Amino acid sequence: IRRVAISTMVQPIFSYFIMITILIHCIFMIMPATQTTYILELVFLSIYTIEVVVKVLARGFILHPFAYLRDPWNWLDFLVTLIGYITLVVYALRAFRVLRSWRTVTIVPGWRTIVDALSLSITSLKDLVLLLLFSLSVFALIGLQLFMGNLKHKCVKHFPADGSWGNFTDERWFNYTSNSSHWYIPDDWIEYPLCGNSSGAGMCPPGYTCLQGYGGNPNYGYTSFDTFGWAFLSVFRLVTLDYWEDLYQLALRSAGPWHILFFIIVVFYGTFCFLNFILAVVVMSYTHMVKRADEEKVVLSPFFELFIAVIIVLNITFMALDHHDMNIEFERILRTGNYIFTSIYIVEAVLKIIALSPKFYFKDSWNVFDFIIVVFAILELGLVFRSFRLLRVFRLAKFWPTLNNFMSVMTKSYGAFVNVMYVMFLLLFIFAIIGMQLFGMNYIDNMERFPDGDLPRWNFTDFLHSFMIVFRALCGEWIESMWDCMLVGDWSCIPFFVAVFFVGNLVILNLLIALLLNNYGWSNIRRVCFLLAKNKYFQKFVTAVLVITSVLLALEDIYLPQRPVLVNITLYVDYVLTAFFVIEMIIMLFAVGFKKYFTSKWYWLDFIVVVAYLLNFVLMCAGIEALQTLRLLRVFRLFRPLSKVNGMQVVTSTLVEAVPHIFNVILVGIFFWLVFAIMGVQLFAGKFYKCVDENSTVLSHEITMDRNDCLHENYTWENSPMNFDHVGNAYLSLLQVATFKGWLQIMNDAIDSREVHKQPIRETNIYMYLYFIFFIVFGSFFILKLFVCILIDIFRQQRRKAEGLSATDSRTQLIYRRAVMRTMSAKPVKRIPKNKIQGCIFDLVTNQAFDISIMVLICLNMVTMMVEKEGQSQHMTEVLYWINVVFIILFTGECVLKLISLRHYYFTVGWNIFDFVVVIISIVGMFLADLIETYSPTLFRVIRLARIGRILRLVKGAKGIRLLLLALRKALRTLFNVSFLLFVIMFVYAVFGMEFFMHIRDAGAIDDVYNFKTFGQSIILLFQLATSAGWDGVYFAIANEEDCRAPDHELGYPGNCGSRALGIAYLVSYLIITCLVVINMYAAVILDYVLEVYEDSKEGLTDDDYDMFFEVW
Amino acid sequence: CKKYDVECDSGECCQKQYLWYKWRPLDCRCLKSGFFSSKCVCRDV
Ligand SMILES: CN(C)[C@H]1CCCC[C@@H]1Nc1ccc(S(=O)(=O)NC(=O)c2cc(Cl)c(OCC3CCCC3)cc2F)c(F)c1
Ligand SMILES: CC(C)CCC[C@@H](C)[C@H]1CC[C@H]2[C@@H]3CC=C4C[C@@H](OC(=O)CCC(=O)O)CC[C@]4(C)[C@H]3CC[C@]12C
Ligand SMILES: *[C@@H]1O[C@H](CO)[C@@H](O)[C@H](O)[C@H]1NC(C)=O
Ligand SMILES: *[C@@H]1O[C@H](CO)[C@@H](O)[C@H](O)[C@H]1NC(C)=O
Ligand SMILES: *[C@@H]1O[C@H](CO)[C@@H](O)[C@H](O)[C@H]1NC(C)=O
């Protein structure tokens, strides 16, 4: 018995039998269930019970140290078997049987490293979880205080004076106002527009008043700051940057532009800091695991090569030149060129095989690749094999050194990459099965709840759609799917989607980033002028002049013509600045001389500005209007003084040393996106046309089968704005896909696509999703995440150089040096208690029980803050005010007792000072709360935020939270410098966009509230765009060139037409500079400091160790 | 000469056609018809 069980258990045949059974079981869960599926589930359950019986008879149950349930693997298997039998005996529970598939992770070699890294990351995220909860709660309370009911603001028609509704009575007015038919809504809109009486907020049309407390909240009532739970969901959504432009715009439209400040904080503190902490934790976990893994342990002449290289480049260019709606000459050229290229390739292969003996020729890998290409070409011209043509592009890898090194690096460490990708796809499969089971029927049962009773494009109806929705959540979009799920489902949708976001986005994708980081990483005059140039006052004066004039330049808005005084100031400043630039250039030329002036880049910038201003001045003298683009070049003088700010040198040094690597990665990405864009052109070129009516609505294929029927019924045969008609369009659409902005429409048109000149049909071509999935793996998860890795490495080196550390020292030596330097500065201190009564108070105060009681009181006060909600009675508000009064009194008693006990020693500790400040603020608040509210509601709400001060004491006493906050405080100066660089870049782009797109007509994201008319609105848009959020709408607005009227110079009309080329340049440059370079800098900084802290607390000494030493001493 | 939506090689296309209620000029264009494959047809400019 026992002998048989042991002998059978450890044979690999049994393990592989069970693994094959599990894989078959997965394949059967993918397919819909029938009677066959029922019998096969019984078969599978029988196999699993045989396994469990064998294992238990082999080992035991729990008693032994090596019993059956001593390993979590057996725990998972046994629990799933119990759940399967429970489902058989007696629905939501039967989904989790899919968890058995987790065992399949062991098939791939090298899985132990990835599994251990994942487990270490999860176990290390505990303290980050505590800090995340606290910070999210604080922000949710602030948002509840700021935006309570603001998202319910609606434009209501005035009570009619004609008397059709009747003689006015208060009841009659309420009855009229409450009717939904009297709320303003543009036709075809699904949500009511928000309004607000604050300056800069959404205005109501004439005859409409902005009221509060009517109707429901946006998005089926799921997007509001009405309660602490909803505020928490909104804060988490904002932190994750998930569709956050919508909430951002709703809040700023209801409350006013100044509330942007709020979003600045949460975005900076929540996105640029914590998610980077999670990334740092994952990086450390993977690095520890990899460290442990490592520790454990004619035709053959260069001219011919160049000829074939140029032929390959020409072939790639011709393949890229293919597009939709060509002329006959062009494609005749292209096909003839393809025939010539195939002929050249055949000649190359034959000449090589003859010159170099056949046995050796096929030995080389590149030769066999060439031969495969030749075979595919001969088959292609023999006879779809024309897809295989794409392989030719990869031939260029032999000749491009950087691309060759990239591919060699990828081939070196394929095992880890395949393990991570397999884990990602296995987790996606598990989540897709679970979602399909939990939410499968609700989408069909409750279709009516959807806006048109029609099934949404993203659902859980079948396995394919479940996988697509889960993959979309893993990409970062989970809030909208959760909205639909809640509409048809229940609360269970929230934990699911949110969970999918943690496991996939914040753990798995961060782990992929960690892999990428680990693997891819006359004498008088000259004398006076030199003296005046080196002088400090002169340099400060020049900087001040530049900054003042640059700031003035931001006042040139759409209202400038209506301010004659501002126009005069602008003109006179232009003339004075021309004179000033000429004088400064002359002074610098006398000071440094021609040679050094014209070999420096900064003096090139100054000279270019001088030339532009002289050109503008000679134009004004000649009577020609000044070119505005040229006079906008003076802002570029702000970069030299900016680089001289304290501590800014590290950031700029990092950026200048990272430019070459970033350029190389951009080239490699252009190559891979060229491959994908050629494929996209060949797949979707000319297939995005569709029939639309007077209203821009697609028609059924039953009524319009194609373009002929479309035009016979006097309809429009309209093309989609984003398409794959040629390579440039494919580039732009793939950029939309990789950034995850505008991708939904592209895939919808892609999967409805049919033959050319045919009406698209909903989901007739579902499997085209595959095309995008691959791209997102190889164009977004890999190429776009190299920038952050490059920045991390270069910033680590730059900070090492900045602090004077030698490049040759190893990490242990650096840690020892840091410990020694810490030991250099340390001093003891002692306090003295009283007099007997004072000494008794002292003994009471010092006791840790007092601190824990205060801890509890702070927690209760925080909860009382959470209890506040919109729509609560005035009685409830008074009761909550009185509870807060009690808490304030208790904390004031704390301060009195501690002051009495510690005399002047109270102020030695910084946290005592924080508590004292908070208590004084709360007392003044008790004095002023009655007065302030009576004498704008916004002022009272904003001043009541100091209430949050006395719950911020909750962080005091924590150890891990203190560790993270110390890491954040060491990095504060660098983070501020990065933010200042970001704001200067935003200022430059704001002025230029004000010049370019100040008159475009309202379209897409651009409207009355959000546009480039003023500097403030431009800054709002640019802050939103710095995260790449919602740039598809901005692009559609600023690149529009249809139904636009040109300017009339004689009549003075400036126009309302956009520029597609200018829009592309502006937006792509902004996305590359901010989203891919400057924003990533944050992460770099964070990681370094966090790592520096963690290795101090793990393999070194920390300030807390010295603190304990001196408390003892 | 031949009509709209018919194979042609740039020298045999009718000047104009009364198709969908307007006299529309015709040029022999060449439209996507697969991977690196296109069918050359007479369509209006
Ligand atoms: C007896 N009677 C004192 C109470 C009942 C009658 C009406 C008045 C009062 N009602 C009450 C309202 C709100 C809060 S509360 O809890 O919402 N607000 C705060 O405690 C709080 C409020 C403010 Cl304005 C504040 O000022 C900011 C400082 C910053 C610099 C100088 C001003 C500070 C505060 F702590 C509160 F407890 C009490
Ligand atoms: C140094 C770095 C780290 C921080 C930079 C400070 C920003 C938070 C400042 C700089 C410019 C400021 C903006 C300047 C102009 C405006 C317009 C202002 O609204 C108005 O113009 C009110 C008048 C109206 O709307 O009618 C709203 C605040 C806002 C967006 C400001 C919000 C705060 C901003 C972004
Ligand atoms: C709103 O007004 C319309 C117009 O008379 C009326 O038919 C409708 O009943 C009103 N709504 C309610 C809830 O009474
Ligand atoms: C657009 O919609 C309106 C109302 O929904 C309807 O008359 C028609 O579908 C379109 N308008 C016109 C004038 O045809
Ligand atoms: C276009 O549709 C009309 C309407 O039925 C039909 O008479 C005509 O033959 C069609 N032409 C083509 C080329 O399909």
Numbering used by the authors:
A (entry chain A): 129 to 218, 224 to 430, 515 to 600, 608 to 745, 842 to 1154, 1157 to 1257, 1260 to 1437
B (entry chain B): 13 to 57
Per the authors:
Voltage-gated sodium (NaV) channels initiate and propagate action potentials in excitable cells and play important roles in health and disease. NaV channels contain 24-transmembrane segments linked in four homologous domains (DI-DIV), where four peripheral voltage-sensor domains (VSD1-4) surround a central ion-conducting pore module that houses the ion selectivity filter and key ligand and toxin binding sites. The NaV1.7 channel is expressed predominantly in the peripheral nervous system, and genetic studies have identified compelling loss-of-function and gain-of-function phenotypes in human pain syndromes, prompting significant efforts to develop NaV1.7-selective inhibitors as potential novel analgesic drugs. Thus, we sought to exploit an engineered human VSD4-NaV1.7-NaVPas cockroach channel chimeric construct that had been previously shown to complex with small molecule inhibitors and peptide toxins known to target VSD4.
Seeking to leverage existing knowledge of the arylsulfonamide binding pocket, GNE-9296 (compound 2) was synthesized in an attempt to directly graft on a significant portion of the GNE-3565 scaffold. Gratifyingly, this molecule retained substantial potency, affording channel blockade at an IC50 of 47 nM (n = 8). A cryo-EM structure of GNE-9296 bound to the VSD4 NaV1.7-NaVPas channel confirmed that the molecule adopts the desired hybrid binding mode. Here, the anionic group of the novel hybrid compound binds in the same position as in the aryl and acyl poses, interacting closely with R4, as seen for the aryl-like binding. The aryl- and acylsulfonamide-derived structural motifs of GNE-9296 occupy their expected positions in the pockets formed between S2/S3 and S3/S4, respectively. Notably, in this hybrid configuration, Y1537 adopts a similar arrangement as observed for the arylsulfonamides. Further analysis of the cryo-EM structure of GNE-9296 revealed that the aryl ring in the S2/S3 binding pocket was shifted ~1 Å away from the VSD4 core compared to arylsulfonamides such as GNE-3565 (data not shown). The aryl ring in the S3/S4 pocket exhibited better overlap with the analogous substituents in the GDC-0310 structure. (G) FSC between two half datasets yields a global resolution estimate of approximately 3.1 Å resolution from the refinement using an overall mask of the VSD4-NaV1.7-NaVPas channel bound to GNE-9296 (compound 2). In addition to offering valuable information for retrospective analysis of historical NaV1.7 VSD4 domain inhibitors, the structure of GDC-0310 inspired the development of a class of structurally differentiated inhibitors that trap a novel conformation of VSD4. These hybrid molecules bridge both the S2/S3 and S3/S4 helical gaps, with the anionic moiety situated centrally, interacting with the arginine gating charge network within the core of the domain.
